């Protein structure tokens, strides 16, 4: 079926016409990706002793 084609039409995320700046979403995606192991370590250390 006919979907729109263009430079920014090939990606699931929205870049140009945005309410919040795109840098926030772009770096938050990889920040939560990087913080998943930190959350896991914090949980596994809480269930022992410390923080």
């Amino acid at each position: 079926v006919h979907f729109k084609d263009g430079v920014y039409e090939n990606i699931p995320f929205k870049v140009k016409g945005r309410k919040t700046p795109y840098a926030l979403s772009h770096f938050g995606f990889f920040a939560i990706g990087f913080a998943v192991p930190f959350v896991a370590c914090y949980v596994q250390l809480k269930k022992s002793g410390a923080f």
């Binding site: 430079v7 090939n10 990606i11 370590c41």
Partner: protein, 534 residues
């Protein structure tokens, strides 16, 4: 927006979804590697308060995230799904719903792996899930079961993608392509698909029997009942060595394209490239038992297996030498993908040489489960896969996205990751040869020195990764601006040294594959009238 992505049916959208998931999982695995390499920098419990179980859990998560969730979704999933239909002129990949379901069972494997890490203790068995450490006695709780289910989900995804690739490249070739005229990346993906098809069933059987032993009281590997963990070792490695060749062969396919396009002369012996990849794939199934030289096999078995493992150096040597022959006599446009390809050549040769030294059943006695092995497989895996992914991205992203990346920052990132990865992975060889065991969170304080400098190297590599994350941003918001100014490389092939600027401007693209003739981001379904070829 929901129909286009959640309900997706075309290969390009599924490919970009694969790439996004792969880079997310690679970021998570790199965070785990950073934590491991930070804790393992000085003797004593520094950052993790004791808790060797947590360190083992992080090691398993890092290995799985890198292998089953970064290298394969990107190489097999992303690049394979985006380019295979494009390179062969297929309008859209066969079995498109299967192509969608493979991707969509990937992140759910991620969800269950993460919740395995979060549940009572986490899987601390290594990426290999050897019993009886992984049995119900030593690991209680649902973490090992959830890791087993993550492996099952990614096996389902890989097998479905392999079937799709096989059918697409066998049936949906354009009207002019015989199998001998296929591009090298297509051949690599086809061979990798057959390797997945013939490998994943054995892994599924072994892992399912392990799960049954854990939870259904049965005894496939329980010594109390007649089992043998060596059976699990056999099954897992019969899967896993073809798995590493599955990881590396698409890298071989990508490097051939990058070399041929940035040396401006075709690949030296393309048919020999196809034959070498086929021989490597066939021989991967015959050498699986060199990971288990220590378990107490007979002398004849180890003598056969060292010879079989050494034989693989011949097709790989042919591929390496033909890449140098292709680079020889050309006009090297030292762009970022070509830099990555050259680094791939050098560091993959180093890793393969270490593996050849490891293939001996006599030297493996001194090197098994040491940091020499981690040096070897981190060289081959990290370099020949991550560098291949970087080259493929820096090579195809301006065609996939219509957005052109900054080149100075790309070269800085390449140099930073090159030096950091070398610094982290070269002292591992010294640590392993000195006698440092593998999978230890704490070591005798005589191994500290190198473990310090290697811990420095990660802080470089991750930093380059961060720069890469900025480059994407600079590509995704300033790609058109990068085209209009002089901050990027617009043409991957420069005019020949007789060719005027206008003659080039009317013939800007001179490529051996369809992918580069397609417009800024290619139409949702191209090849209306089938592409013709003589």
């Amino acid at each position: 927006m929901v129909q286009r992505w959640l309900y997706s049916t075309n290969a390009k959208d599924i490919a970009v979804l694969y790439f996004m998931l792969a880079i997310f999982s690679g970021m998570a695995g790199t965070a785990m590697s950073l934590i491991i390499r930070l804790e393992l920098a000085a003797p004593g419990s520094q950052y993790l308060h004791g808790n060797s179980q947590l360190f083992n859990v992080l090691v398993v998560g890092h290995a799985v995230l890198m292998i089953f969730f970064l290298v394969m979704p990107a190489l097999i999933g992303g690049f394979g799904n985006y380019l295979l239909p494009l390179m062969i002129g297929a309008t859209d990949t066969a079995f498109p719903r299967i192509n969608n379901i493979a991707f969509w069972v990937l992140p759910m494997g991620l969800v269950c792996l993460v919740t395995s890490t979060l549940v009572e203790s986490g899987a601390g068995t290594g990426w290999t899930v050897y019993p009886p450490l992984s049995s119900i006695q030593a690991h209680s709780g649902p973490s090992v079961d959830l890791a087993i289910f993550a492996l099952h989900l990614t096996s389902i995804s890989s097998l479905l993608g392999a079937i799709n690739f096989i059918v697409t490249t066998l049936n949906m070739r354009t009207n002019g392509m015989t199998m001998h005229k296929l591009p090298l990346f297509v051949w690599s993906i086809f061979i990798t698909a057959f390797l997945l098809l013939l490998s994943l069933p054995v892994l599924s059987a072994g892992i399912t029997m392990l799960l049954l032993d854990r939870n259904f009281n049965t005894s496939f590997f329980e010594v109390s009942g007649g089992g043998d963990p060596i059976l699990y070792e056999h099954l897992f490695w019969f899967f896993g060595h073809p798995e590493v060749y599955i990881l590396i062969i698409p890298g071989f396919g990508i490097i051939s394209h990058v070399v041929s396009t940035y040396s401006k002369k075709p690949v030296f012996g393309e048919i020999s490239m196809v034959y070498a990849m086929a021989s490597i794939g066939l021989l991967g199934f015959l050498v699986w038992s060199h990971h288990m030289y220590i378990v107490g096999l007979d002398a004849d078995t180890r003598a056969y297996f060292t010879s079989a493992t050494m034989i693989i150096a011949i097709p790989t040597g042919i591929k390496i030498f033909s890449w140098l022959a292709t680079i020889h006599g050309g006009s090297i446009r030292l762009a970022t993908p070509m830099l990555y390809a050259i680094a791939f050549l050098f560091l993959f040769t180093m890793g393969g040489l270490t593996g050849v030294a490891l293939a001996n059943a006599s030297l493996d006695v001194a090197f098994h489960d040491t940091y020499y092995v981690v040096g070897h497989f981190h060289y081959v895996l990290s370099m020949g896969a991550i560098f291949s992914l970087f080259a493929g991205y820096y090579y195809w992203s301006p065609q996939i996205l219509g957005l052109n990346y900054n080149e100075k920052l790309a070269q800085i990132q390449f140099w930073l990751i090159f030096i950091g990865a070398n610094v982290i992975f070269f002292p591992m060889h010294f640590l392993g040869i000195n006698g440092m065991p593998r999978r230890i969170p704490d070591y005798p304080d005589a191994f500290a020195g190198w473990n310090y400098v290697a811990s420095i190297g990660s802080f470089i590599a991750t930093l380059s990764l961060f720069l890469f994350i900025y480059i994407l941003y600079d590509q995704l918001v300033n790609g058109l601006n990068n085209k209009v100014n002089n901050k990027s490389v617009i043409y991957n092939k420069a005019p020949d040294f007789v060719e005027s600027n206008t003659i080039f401007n009317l013939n800007t693209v001179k490529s051996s594959s369809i992918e580069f003739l397609l417009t800024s981001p290619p139409a949702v379904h191209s090849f209306n009238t089938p592409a013709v070829q003589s």
